[PDB]
Assembly symmetry: C3
Amino acid sequence: NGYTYEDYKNTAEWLLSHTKHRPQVAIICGSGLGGLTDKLTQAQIFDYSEIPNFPRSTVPGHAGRLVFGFLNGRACVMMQGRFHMYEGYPLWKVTFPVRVFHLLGVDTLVVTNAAGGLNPKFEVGDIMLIRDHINLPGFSGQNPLRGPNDERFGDRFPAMSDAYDRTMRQRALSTWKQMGEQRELQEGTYVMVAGPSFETVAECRVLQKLGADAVGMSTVPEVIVARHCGLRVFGFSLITNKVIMDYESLEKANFEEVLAAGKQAAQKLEQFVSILMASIPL
Amino acid sequence: NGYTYEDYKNTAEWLLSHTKHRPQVAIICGSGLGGLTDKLTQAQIFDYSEIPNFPRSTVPGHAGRLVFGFLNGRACVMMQGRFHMYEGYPLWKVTFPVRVFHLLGVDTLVVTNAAGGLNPKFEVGDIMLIRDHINLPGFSGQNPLRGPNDERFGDRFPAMSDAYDRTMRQRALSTWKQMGEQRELQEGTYVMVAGPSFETVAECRVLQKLGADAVGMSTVPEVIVARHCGLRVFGFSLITNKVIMDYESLEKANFEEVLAAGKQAAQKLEQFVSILMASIPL
Amino acid sequence: NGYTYEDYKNTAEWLLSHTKHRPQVAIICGSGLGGLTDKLTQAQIFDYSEIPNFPRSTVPGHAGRLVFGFLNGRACVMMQGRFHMYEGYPLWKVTFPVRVFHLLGVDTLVVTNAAGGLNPKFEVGDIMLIRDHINLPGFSGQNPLRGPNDERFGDRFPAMSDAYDRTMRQRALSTWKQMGEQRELQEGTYVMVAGPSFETVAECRVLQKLGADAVGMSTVPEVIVARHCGLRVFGFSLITNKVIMDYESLEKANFEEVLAAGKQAAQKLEQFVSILMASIPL
Ligand SMILES: O=c1[nH]cnc2c(C[N@@H+]3C[C@H](CO)[C@@H](O)C3)c[nH]c12
Ligand SMILES: O=c1[nH]cnc2c(C[N@@H+]3C[C@H](CO)[C@@H](O)C3)c[nH]c12
Ligand SMILES: O=c1[nH]cnc2c(C[N@@H+]3C[C@H](CO)[C@@H](O)C3)c[nH]c12
């Protein structure tokens, strides 16, 4: 890890002295979900590039910002554009923001992402509440906590079996019902793979045999660091496509499929996340 | 990645100006299949060591060469000796040649390798056409595309579900039949593991449960880069041994088993690859 | 790999000239099993910090020592405190001691560790003889042998299917019986995951579906290097906890659970290992 405790501290103190805002809930916007930032009030924007120690977004669009504000009753800080392992960033950079949030006083992390549906029940547009995850990169050594542990952040061996807050998942299922929606709220296991290339049929079948319901290339690292910090964690995936699981299919996954899904059924998540804020204690 | 676009360009321009040859088909010879280079005509040899930017073959035998020539009607470039992740090379070095080939004007990549048979139907000597692959290293982050993407080569998120050209596999199955051969042409999924040590019984069973038919320590990376480049890709494995899958067996996999298999039934692949050239469009 | 052959040689020659002891059996003590060092006679202690080229134990307790002595009839060298991948050490550092032992004249390696039970038959306190292992990190590239091979240590492609000495496992099962013990001696497959965070329910189920009986974050690397060296290898795990495999459970794995188990049923292993020494040929 190239960061020392001081680095996280310095970045937090810089932010704290450049904004009157004091966030309680940190929200990471997945692909095509950045619009969520438009629902904040008294919003204050910070480009990642201007924040000390922040990984500088190479060239995925040069759009990487931290937005502080209020979202339906809660002091929030949103990440519009997140870092991925496939871009070349080691995991201690990918998750650097999470530890900054903790030092800012955030006690809750809401993570969202786009994902390929592995579970056949799922349909494009569906929203999957994340009940658990399979950290494939983690089994091999790509775990954000690798390296000496800093007691100031947490324990050497944190548990992850209870990573996704049970209470929030219940209130999430409730809220979705209280809203009376067409499709039911899906729930399941998210498996992380490094990417950036999409899965083959044989790989899709592997992921399915392991019991995964959705596949993506992010999230798990941030969740692990959040939990290590003691933050409450809740999240979901927007199923943007059904992964090809048989050789008969003549279609293939693409960047267009994802953002298009994250174009129409996108707003649904935005509302959901906004309303869900009221369900977050304080 | 330690290479810049210029590096691939410079290596290609160096090669293009040192040979009259202009290859269309790049062929990577697997272990004990290097003999294929003997069937080329008007052959021109280049030691890897003399080619700018090429990874210098440490000491597996100091024999690493790029051979340009004509193989049964096609302008080819063959790699005699390929780079493996287990030797210490990062994947952007292992696959460096593939991107060079693309800039040389190659539009087809034929990959061959030796592999342990996981599917019980398989027998030593069998030839398995590769229909799909499981990129285990890739799930964890060891994917040749990790790092910033260069649009000049391809997209950020390329698909791999259609990596192994359907047309070529059909024509391959045809050709094998048109030849009238003793054993049938096997077909299946190739799973890549980093190695260099051989699998344990428990690991063999894992690989089998995942749906893999053959196991090796190469190929997948080159295939991914080829596909990312837009090259047509076809390949197969020479089953050099049956991986031990039960504790009763008193035998063990060894370097001798592999090359010996790649000694007798080796020539069969050579002929097949040569004849298959006519089936490659232009 | 940052070590050259000379480095292993220099460390061995330093040790050989600082102790009259000439070990035959190297023993790696797992978590909460370090007490085994108390049963040695004519013990001579070396702090890791004073041994040339040894990885310097960061801050897990600053307690890292190499103890030479006699254990029930055998010249031993014990590692009290072992290196883990999750601490940040690359595998060539984690396994550095193993190659030193080989040069010291050791021909047998006994590895012990604490592990979570995946097999439902297992109960906290149980002892599992290791019959095989699943090297998950290894599939991805994290294999201690990655990099150029040194013939002086072993072959480029060593087999691992017979890693855990059949004879010793039999004599181990015998010894345990000759002692007449309450619980039966468990036997099974050990799966290594990098850690340091504990497994989620979904991950536990993955590990179970793969056929693993116990899960830990060490051992496999040392075993692979030992085998590559030609050493005889035997080992076992102390089941310190039952990994959560269903969402109904309201408990979670923790550092306290492990050491507590490695507190009571710990001595049982110590005796077993001591007695087992007589079963090790010479
Ligand atoms: O089929 C899939 N496989 C793996 N990841 C995704 C995702 C998730 N994100 C979306 C984004 C690519 O379009 C990249 O960062 C991965 C959507 N569909 C799939
Ligand atoms: O049983 C096996 N397991 C994994 N790879 C191979 C291979 C393939 N190549 C062959 C070569 C070793 O002999 C090394 O580079 C791996 C043949 N048999 C097996
Ligand atoms: O449930 C488990 N999962 C993974 N490893 C272990 C271990 C083994 N060691 C023990 C130690 C943590 O308490 C760390 O180095 C891992 C015991 N229980 C479990």
